[PDB]
Amino acid sequence: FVNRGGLPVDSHTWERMWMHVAKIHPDGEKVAQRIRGATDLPKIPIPSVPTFQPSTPVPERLEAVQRYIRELQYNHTGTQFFEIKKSRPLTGLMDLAKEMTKEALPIKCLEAVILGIYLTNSMPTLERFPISFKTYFSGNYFRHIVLGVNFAGRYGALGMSRREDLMYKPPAFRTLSELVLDFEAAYGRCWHVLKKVKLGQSVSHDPHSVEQIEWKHSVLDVERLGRDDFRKELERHARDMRLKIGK
């Protein structure tokens, strides 16, 4: 369920959110009856957007960016509060990122990617690029996206997920392949088989850029490739990104 018309949430989408809750939760209407109109609810502090001293090393800045993303909370309400159109020009997506910092609602993985780009445009020596993972568990396919990053030749990731090992990686992996294989192993530990990886090109650091994010610059079919061809394909993506300069 996606809120397809800004904030405040309109009466129709608001009721649909509560209707949807009543389906999911075993005591779904007991939950609404206790929350809706309640006058004693916690005040939620608006998280402060982190700002960085120039003497602060970038990896320490990334920790603060990821902390801020987590503070918004993963969205378990069943209703997505921001519409993300993935082919929107970057400048429109950055307007959306800013709106997300001003409204401060829970988010999921794709919103966190956009936010990660917005909060690291101030770091021109940081390379940012989306990584999407398609996995398989119990006869079903699952998609997850993170923001891959590269600082001083080391690879890491920012993002949001239900699982702690499927989001933040400090920029410590020497190669892109090592980063991706770290995700594949984390998936295997929770019984998901990794089927595809889709890697985007690096994203411009200009928040007024009209260019689109290219999400699928490399699409890798994991088991059709085999391990050596899989690594070589990732090395090639790493070189392609090095040669696309943008800020």
Partner: peptide, 29 residues
């Protein structure tokens, strides 16, 4: 004037986070 939109957003945001806590609690149990 426009302070009704703000109170609307404030009331909605508080219920959104209360709901998110309950749903988060459920979706691990």
């Amino acid at each position: 004037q426009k302070s009704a939109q703000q109170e609307l957003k404030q009331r909605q945001r508080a219920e959104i986070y209360a709901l998110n806590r309950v749903m988060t609690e459920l979706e691990q149990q």
